[PDB]
């Protein structure tokens, strides 16, 4: 406790005395965040290194132990610059510019160390509840007690405080506080997989203000801590590794629910409206489609039209009208048909590229699976579910089996997928 | 020392699998049948060796019948100890072990029959001498094998007869199990008949210099 | 093994067979089969050297089936 | 102190106790260090010094020691290593690190321990013939990888803490197969709760694999046997599910409660802790050669490569060394060499990817040694896969979807084209094949990737593979009076993806038949199976290679591997007009009279072949000779697939470009 106090003091002085030019940036960010009810703080590591190298060295070697001290320093500063108290413990989000480590280069040498890596999100779980403030009572003497928990990896006391039993204590669920927990699954970048190897996956955990931030198929950059948890596999003394997320950078501006709101600052909106006023914007957009392909101007114009898309209408009688464009290219070999499909995948914010030979109706529309634990049936998305609000590029379309190809008829026009299997009867949206 | 084995053969009369009764348990017999399954050659523990945890005293030649048996009363001093031994796997002697499944011959099977089966144990130098699909004549001693799971195996791995399939309800309580023994506790011990074989017989190089050697 | 004159007789017989065929049924595989038959006939006589008589016998056996 | 003569006599009635004695373990270490420092081969160069020099350069963590070297001199240490691996390896790793710290002082900041990998153990066993006499000894076993658990961290120095006495226990070395069991306190004097001493500990990488018996080794019609192998750090992810491997390791035993409960007798479980791994997937040269990887080179070998790479006519000798015992068919050999060396893949601004591998097709009459050439290509290639006709399926040459027995989740499994990534896939009898199976390679031949959308899995794989295929014409034989399109059943989409097409015709010619027969008979004569003798064998086997091979095959394999790994030539200065004119002329002379589809896809093959010919010379820039040679090859591959009526006119019309 005689070192934790000095650590908290050092962090508070960093927050309150850092200045560049003529503005306390980290003091102003806290006040601006408090006004819009954002209880968090983002710190760049380069500033921390510049301020004092000892503070950075303390954090770099003991993250799980040091980070909560910075967490409480932030909320001590907040109550001073906001109040002369329903302020929960704040959150720290970190930014780093260090070298990125591949997933397959992570091993026993990197345990309990902060790392930076990139990958592809393949699945997002549901939100779960974790306790922070626990109200506790004993089964016999019946007196009140409290416990405070931080999520940086505790149990009820195996005793009694004031005969009572061994560990007699129950949780009073009312007057207890909880936060949000989410689990995500990662995968390697397809071009970084070694020779003859299948891609591997990893598990990550996010908390509080970093939940509902990514969607499956997204390419992201993750800053977090590489840790292990004992659980459960006949090996002796083996543990399972995972990553606790501290910072997320995502290419797609869309959040989990795609709020359909502007995420553009005025500095970019001005650029976009200036671009829109160009008298020859159509030619500029057309010339940007696959600049390494000669000719084929009409196909590129069609691709631009498909990328922008039409309008969608709803009528009083419940009718729905499609507002998306579908394009077919039936031609001779060697005419760059397959070099435009992979370009449309890159340019589109949301896009999936599939082959007709290696496909199936379940893989394209939706599948039904059985949970090993619960032993019930649930629905899992497919190619047309992932590529919602985007584009799906189906190559070798003529080689598709006749059973699999007919499953796309409803999704192409009615933009819905009807499943009536195993006691599950639902209709899912698919606008692609 | 070489653990020796004695192999008997050329018995006067041969038995079929359907002549196996409990009144020949312990006797020397010969049987005939068709092999339908063989297992791996596993090492069996023959002469165990342990070390007391505290004294570090060494015990050797601890016979084992059907389950992992550690010594009880400590060796030469004053030390008192009932358990907590450490097997010296290097000093202990091992032997080869194999289990083969056999069934009745095509002629001994009645007009309408579900073939009877048996478990034959090959040990020592007799491993791999019986191959599936062949017809072999075994000779040895008819023994009885108990259920060791309810005899208190040390590890928690047995977990008191963990099962994946449902046992027969018809023989639930019909299979006569003996109780009373302190090792069993309130449990019931059960037995089944198996065979232990000591001799096996079957009843159903372009080098010039080495070739000239064999011929008379 | 094959002797010096056996190789010349073998190549001569292969050339003659190829000439008589005319390439529709006769290939290198026929020459290899003739070598195999000569070696087998030599094994029959318990001799470690091959004589052109053996190649003549193998050639006759090949011709009898074509 | 003792002497090498004194290690012969043994005490304690056990070799392990004799080795672990303090006085013996000091002589053993000194003798091992003398062996490491002072060993020289016939040429007089210390090999282990060079290996140690390379170790630091590559930031390696392991050292490879041949068993034959340590058996030829200091044979007693070889016998001790053979019988007692565990105690010998601990000493030998320490002496290896001490020897390593004589070339790279302060190397302990990179790696803290040096591991030793034993090679070329004399006795090879099968999984069927393992018995109890092999317990606690070094063994060599071949098998086929089936399933792999994955990489998890494992404790190395285990610690415990007791609360009532607050005692901290000394570090314990974990067996990696048996949990550390401690119940007695040096201080508490009684039973106490034991913690794991959270944090402040050292981990290692751990993985587990299952080896089945290879189908070739298994007797026909019998069930295979399997065993479990534990792979420690530096050995994880080396072996892949589906490959065939050879493992040198230690055979151990352990007590299992379930095994005793089910069988009813005190039987024990066995497992192998892996020491050395050697790949044997596609390799038939395992009959000879020494080491763990025969495609790897040493410094003097690289210097010899650079010495022979500057001789004029290296390309001619490389071509002549392809399938030496086959007579003639020089165009097929040139195409095979060009495919083997390969081109250079490209990416333009990160949005336009261009393939860099050459595919070859052989269409010819029966009995023209196409399959033997395919077998030679399989033997020479670093990674090779073989398939034939109706024995391959749509998902057998592609990725398949299976339910994981443990996790019970749909997962992807490999195939023929994925097993040969950065390798060669060979397909014999390519015309006697279903269309649905044939059409599965359309994406892999050009885009060099595989896309799967099945059962909730939406993924794209990578297959950078080259295809050499052999086929038969319609009727079994080629009609030279007909165009190509009526001699085969394949259509344009699959014919365009091939770079080089070789039409093999059998014609009646007395002198040609005489020469071929003489060559074949001489070959049969040569191949008839009827200082140290083991080197007399090598010199006799080299004398036979002298006649028909300008360069030895073992040298050529490493040459090809080094060229593919290191060289990446470019196309800075070249004649664009000649290539443009050639492409335009080839396009014009196809629709007018021809049935060989020419598109933009054939323009890039000339550049790929030019880059391949540049690679053959170990040069970083493509010259004019290589481009001219590529143009000549492409033109000769097109002219000789015409009708006899127009071939003479087309050859004359195209002869101006190939003046040299
Ligand atoms: N107009 C063009 N400009 C530039 N490159 C081209 C053009 N047409 C074809 N190519 C090149 O041809 C090669 C093969 O093209 P691609 O793979 O797109 O063929 P495709 O139209 O999909 O054929 P297939 O019908 O056989 O599937 C690529 O390297 C591509 O860059
Ligand atoms: N110069 C040669 N030309 C042809 N065959 C040769 C030559 N030299 C030797 N042979 C032998 O001729 C035989 C015929 O070869 P092979 O079996 O490969 O013919 P293929 O018709 O191409 O085969 P497949 O139908 O299996 O593809 C082989 O045993 C081969 O070793
Ligand atoms: Mg295509
Ligand atoms: Zn109480
Ligand atoms: Zn004792
Ligand atoms: Zn204690």
Swiss-Prot record, chain B:
The modification Phosphoserine is found at residue 113. It is found in: Nucleus. It comes from the Eukaryota. Belongs to the MCM family. Component of the MCM2-7 complex. The complex forms a toroidal hexameric ring with the proposed subunit order MCM2-MCM6-MCM4-MCM7-MCM3-MCM5; loaded onto DNA, forms a head-head double hexamer. Interacts with MCM10. Present with 13400 molecules/cell in log phase SD medium. Early fractionation of eukaryotic MCM proteins yielded a variety of dimeric, trimeric and tetrameric complexes with unclear biological significance. Specifically a MCM467 subcomplex is shown to have in vitro helicase activity which is inhibited by the MCM2 subunit. The MCM2-7 hexamer is the proposed physiological active complex. Acts as a component of the MCM2-7 complex (MCM complex) which is the putative replicative helicase essential for 'once per cell cycle' DNA replication initiation and elongation in eukaryotic cells. The active ATPase sites in the MCM2-7 ring are formed through the interaction surfaces of two neighboring subunits such that a critical structure of a conserved arginine finger motif is provided in trans relative to the ATP-binding site of the Walker A box of the adjacent subunit. The six ATPase active sites, however, are likely to contribute differentially to the complex helicase activity. This is DNA replication licensing factor MCM6. It comes from Saccharomyces cerevisiae (strain ATCC 204508 / S288c). The gene is MCM6. The chain holds residues 260 to 509 of 1017 of the full protein.
